[PDB]
Every structure is written in C-alpha cells, then in structure tokens.
C-alpha cells in the first residue's frame, strides 16, 4: 500500500532467498571452494538485511571482518589442504544425513512453533538513526568489561594461533 515499504519488502525477500540458497550451496555442494564463495555471498546478503533493520555500523563491520578477513582466511586454509578430494564413500553416508535432516527439521518446526505462539512486544516507537555514537556510549557506560576483556581475548587468540600453526 506504498512504494517505500514495497521496496523494503521486495529487497528483504530477495536477500532472504539469496541467503537460504547460498547457505544450502555451502552445505550441499561437493566442491568446497564454491561453498566458500557462496558463504561470502551469504555474508553480503546478511549485511544488506541488517540495513533494513536500522543497523549500519554492524553491517559494514560484517562486510569488513567476515567476508573481508575471515573468508579470505578460509580461502587460504582451503588450498592449504586440497589434495584432489579423494574420498571413498561409507555405506551409511545417506543414514547420517537423514538423521541430521529430521533432527534439524524438527528444531526448525519447534522454533517456528515458538516464533508464532509468543506475544512479542512490538514497541511502536521510531528507532534512532545514530547507531554509532550510542554504541560508543555503551562501550564505556554499560558494556565496558567485555571491551576490556575482549582485548585480552584477542591477545590470547593471536598468541595461540601464532604458536599452533608455526612450522617447526
């Protein structure tokens, strides 16, 4: 019933279809390089979904870290370990899949049964655009311990990966 809310809807469903299709491509395709590039596609589509939900900083950060850094790291680690993917099948190759599928499917239905049953609190107020100054205030008012402590998390992760992949 409008043009400005219609573009949001069409863009949302397009991005969601892209996300689902590319994640299924990540998971089902036998070749893994295609899966890595489609994973990058998933990350871009999710970063485009966040912008509809009034989160721009985190969207740019997802585009800057996951696809920018982590996905490149995966594209290195994958050719580190490519040897023509010579894998012989197991007899139960279908069995496990089936189990996972039904299990996974149940969870979805279960989660869906929640998502449509519970009375969410829609809180009709226009959100705030300045979603970057506020995060700055929260890093030093409310959520300061995670800031100060993710510092040493990153230190420890560097110290770990540097001494677990070292060639000696």
């Amino acid at each position: 019933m409008d043009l400005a809310t219609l573009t949001q809807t069409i863009t949302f469903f397009a991005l969601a279809a892209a996300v689902i299709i590319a994640a299924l491509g990540v998971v089902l395709l036998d070749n893994v390089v295609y899966s890595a590039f489609l994973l990058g596609g998933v990350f871009l589509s999710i970063a485009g979904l966040y912008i509809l939900m009034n989160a721009d900083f985190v969207s740019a950060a997802q585009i800057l870290i996951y696809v920018g850094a982590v996905n490149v790291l995966i594209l290195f680690a994958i050719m580190l370990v490519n040897k023509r993917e010579t894998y012989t099948p197991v007899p139960g190759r279908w069995l496990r899949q089936g189990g996972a599928a039904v299990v996974s499917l149940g969870v979805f239905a279960l989660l869906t049964k929640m998502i449509l049953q519970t009375p969410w609190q829609l809180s009709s107020v226009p959100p705030t655009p300045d979603s970057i100054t506020t995060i700055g205030q929260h890093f030093f008012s409310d959520f300061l311990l995670p800031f100060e402590l993710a510092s040493v998390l990153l230190l420890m992760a560097l110290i770990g990966a540097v001494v677990l992949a070292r060639r000696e």
Partner: protein, 78 residues
C-alpha cells in the same frame, strides 16, 4: 581448475618467452617454499650452427656472422 597442493618442492618454468632481454633461456627451477634448491638451465634455444658454418666460409665471407655472438657489441668478436 585447481592444483592440489602438497608438501613437496615446487617446479616452475621461466621459459623462453621471458618478459625481458636476457636472451631466451629456460631455468627449470625447483623451490622449497619461495626458496631455490637448484635449477636445470635448458639453454640451447639459439643454436643455429656457427662452428660448422665456419668451414665453408672464408674470413671475409664469415666476418658478418661474427657480430651475432655478442649482439650488444659486434666488434669484440670481429
């Protein structure tokens, strides 16, 4: 499309078609992780047969051949 990495020294070809001036020269080079163990230089791409041409050619007939050994300076050999 891909190349199937493995823990072995890599062999690469710096073939006749250099993007340079230093003749035409092969350097079948084997490396250990951006290193160099050794290389077989397969020269021979410019043998046209001087030392057997110089036996049906007298001095004045052969002297223009002579300036093609060092293409840069054709008087250290004349």
């Amino acid at each position: 499309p891909k190349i199937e990495t493995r823990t072995e020294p890599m062999v690469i070809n710096m073939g006749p078609h250099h993007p340079s001036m230093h003749g035409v020269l092969r350097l079948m080079v084997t490396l250990d992780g951006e290193d160099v163990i050794d290389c077989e230089p397969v020269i021979g791409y410019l043998h046209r047969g001087m030392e057997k041409i110089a036996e049906n050619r007298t001095n004045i007939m052969f002297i223009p051949y002579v300036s093609r050994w060092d293409y840069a300076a054709g008087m250290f050999n004349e």
